[PDB]
Amino acid sequence: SPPLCTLPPGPEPPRFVCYCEGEESGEGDRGGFNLYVTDAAELWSTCFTPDSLAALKARFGLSAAEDITPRFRAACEQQAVALTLQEDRASLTLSGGPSALAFDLSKVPGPEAAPRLRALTLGLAKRVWSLERRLAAAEETCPGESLINPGFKSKKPAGGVDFD
């Protein structure tokens, strides 16, 4: 269950989304490590390489035993995600833990942003579909006219005075 978040944080109507993909363990194989930020109009990807990632985690003081996805999940829980964009290049700050980590995001071509967007639409669809029952399990457990001259009011006989 890869974490994700939307900015601005909280229940405020957001404009951006940040997420991660892959990270499958157990019977399956360890996939890639990609964190994408998009606003349904322009995607941004890490486009990192294993040597670049190793150098980045060595310079910032991390080791190979600390995965970044749990830190992203903790920041999502604490709402500690920030995005800075200059014109098309984004840098996300992850301040969930004691030290704020900085990650650099590059531009994404359209022929990759659009397929990613149309895959992520169904991705979030199935995610929310599963999370519905997940939260359920977690929380729950002529009349009026004289016939002689129709068009003239029907006449009743005179009665006069009758004491009661």
Next chain:
Amino acid sequence: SPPLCTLPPGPEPPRFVCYCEGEGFNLYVTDAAELWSTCFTPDSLAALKARFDITPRFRAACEQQAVALTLQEDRASLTLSGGPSALAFDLSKVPGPEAAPRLRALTLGLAKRVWSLERRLAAACPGESLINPGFKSKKPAGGVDFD
């Protein structure tokens, strides 16, 4: 929270998404690249809601996973079964300029719903002969011993 369903709802990788918003009221089925919308007129909307509100019925159908889809390359017909009787809706393609803000808004809404749902789930020289540098530190001969 407005209801939503994934077609098919099984463990198979989903392909189609259906949603409602507004309660001209329209029903949207999005393949993330193409959108089918009712675009019904107010008189037609009144006639359809009289013959069958639709949001509670749609929500019940989503919970019961009773939404049927029939599509032929331009046309969408939905069988909604969440109320007293089955609901039949006719949907057609919407232009791309109309769907682009719609798809952006639905993407943002899905993302924020997922984040809110996750939040609610959370709250629940060595070796060298120095005399001649460049040569191994010699060992004086020892001969034979007894072991």
